Amino acid sequence: MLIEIHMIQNHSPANLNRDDLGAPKTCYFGGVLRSRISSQCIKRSIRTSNDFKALLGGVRTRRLADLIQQEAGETECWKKAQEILNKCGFKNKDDNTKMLVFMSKDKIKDLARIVLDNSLGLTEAAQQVANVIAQATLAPDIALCGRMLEPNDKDKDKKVKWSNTTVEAALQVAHAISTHIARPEIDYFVAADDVPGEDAGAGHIGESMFASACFYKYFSIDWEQLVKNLKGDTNLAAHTVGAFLLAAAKTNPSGKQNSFAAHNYPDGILVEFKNSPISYANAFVRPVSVVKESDLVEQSIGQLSNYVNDIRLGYYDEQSPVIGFWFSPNNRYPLGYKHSKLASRNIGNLNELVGAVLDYIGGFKWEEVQKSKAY
């Protein structure tokens, strides 16, 4: 069983994701240019969010020796720590690791203990470090994002074996693409000088970029894989599901928000529980073209409703039913005016949507699962 989230959002003029030159990210879908927000940006925005602060139990860092020294008090062990991380197959480059390491924070103090004991040989201590690094994966962080760690082979000392490090992911975030033809814009800027001079203007001259669009978002959480990744815990899984829904509903990427401040909220959410993951992004193969009567958002909602109803009546199955929840703010936009109510419930508030999500998942209460946490 799966938890599927389909979102419709609208954004005021901003630049939420840039490439190495500064232009907003774009893509092609149906042969037309569309504004794009990358999946890694959305996942980082959810993971580093206020509503996901209570479960941030994983750290992906290159400066592991700094955390090891911060765990203890004696300074000199830090030096030895680097050497302990050197024969383990990680290498060094200007006083940091060559590659990033992803691990749960709660076990890091045990790592420090491996350096704290002076009775242990370097090879045995390195093997213990490898064991505790490879095993420390119980955190909601990795649970959905997974891990893939490849220790260095050209530098590693012998007799240092490695256990299983790969963690199967439980999240399948898709890229966010607009539902119309993108219209990128340039923005001429100068930097004025506060002290008068002989010439005029001075300062700096530049041309930034920005764009505005209405986006469609996709999230997919495999319930069984998430539960198995958390070693059979169901309360923590329900808490992770609720926190993820609340964060992804109410967070934005932090790209150039000090000069554009596009802190908009989504206005249409579809939450489904199916056995096979499906995508309704094919509704927008034909781009949404605005007209004089309606607006951009309700046209996209209508096209999405058309495609959802057509898919439900087309690929219908009898032995496996679907149950969907449709959320709009105070029923501002119903899920289509023409077709039937393609939802077992229509919800006007986000908290009731999260409560019903927990109900359909396992009947979990909200405050019952808020006690389960990693950090």
Phi, psi of 309 (to 5 degrees): -65, -40
- Of 328, 209, 206, residue with least CA distance to 269: 328
Of 71-79, 126-134, 329-337, 357-365, the window that binds its own copies (rule: CB under 8 A) is 329-337
Note whether 33 binds other proteins by CB under 8 A.
yes
Contact between 67 and other proteins by CB under 8 A: the answer reads no
Q: In angstroms, rounded to a whole number, what is the distance separating the alpha carbons of residues 348 and 345?
A: 10
Rounded to whole angstroms, how far apart are CA atoms 232 and 256?
41
With contacts defined by CB under 8 A, name the span among 110-118, 128-136, 207-215, 356-364 that binds its own copies: 207-215
Question: What are the angstrom distances between the C-alpha of 122 and each of 52, 80, 156, 163, 340?
Answer: 39, 9, 13, 19, 69
CA 218, 221, 222 angle in degrees (round to 5)? 135
165 makes contact, choosing from other proteins, its own copies, none, with CB < 5 to 8 Å by partner type, with none
Interaction between residue 42 and its own copies (CB under 8 A): yes
Among 259, 341, 366, 368, binds its own copies (CB under 8 A): 259
Question: Which of 1, 22, 100, 201 is in the footprint of other proteins by CB under 8 A?
Answer: 22
Residue 296 makes contact with other proteins by CB under 8 A: no
Find the shortest distance in angstroms from Cβ 369 to its own copies.
16
Least spacing, CB of residue 77 vs other proteins, in Å:
22
* Contact status, residue 67 vs residue 103, Cβ threshold 8 Å: no
Smallest separation (angstroms) from other proteins to the CB of 50: 18
Query: Using CB under 8 A, which residues numbered 136 to 195 contact other proteins?
Result: 181-189
DSSP H helical segments within the chain, as ranges? Answer: 39-47, 64-71, 77-85, 108-116, 122-135, 140-145, 223-229, 235-249, 296-314, 350-362, 366-369
**Based on CB atoms, which residue is closest to its own copies, 120 or 160?**
160
Of the candidates 361, 357, 280, 363, the residue with the CA atom closest to the CA atom of residue 325: 357
Instruction: Please list the alpha-helical segments (H only) found in 230-295.
Output: 235-249
CB of 188 to other proteins, least distance (A): 5
Nearer to other proteins, 22 or 348 (CB): 22
Long-range contacts of 186-192 (CB under 8 A, 24+ apart): none
In the complex with other proteins, the residue whose CB is nearer, 20 or 194, is 20
What are the φ/ψ torsions at residue 298 (nearest 5 degrees)? Answer: -70, -30
Q: Is the Cβ of residue 122 or residue 181 nearer to its own copies in the bound state? A: 181
Closest to other proteins by CB, 24 vs 268, is 24
Q: How many CB atoms lie within 10 A of CB 352?
A: 14
Q: Which of residues 340-359 bind its own copies (CB under 8 A)?
A: 348-351
Residue 346's DSSP bridge partners are 326
Residue 5 interface partner, choices other proteins, its own copies, none, CB cut-off 5-8 Å depending on type: its own copies
Distance CA 265, CA 327 (A): 13
Question: Closest distance between its own copies and the C-beta of residue 204, in Å?
Answer: 6
Interaction of residue 304 with its own copies, rule CB under 8 A = no
Q: Hey, is 103 helix, strand or coil? A: strand
Residues between 185 and 214 with contacts to other proteins, criterion CB under 8 A:
185-189, 207, 209
Q: Is residue 189 a contact residue for its own copies (CB under 8 A)? A: yes
Rg (CA), the chain: 25
Mark residues 219-248: x for contact with its own copies by CB under 8 A, - for none: xxxxxx--------------xxx-xxxxxx
Tokens for 136? Answer: 């420390």
Residues that bind other proteins (CB under 8 A): 14-15, 20-24, 26, 32-33, 181-189, 207, 209
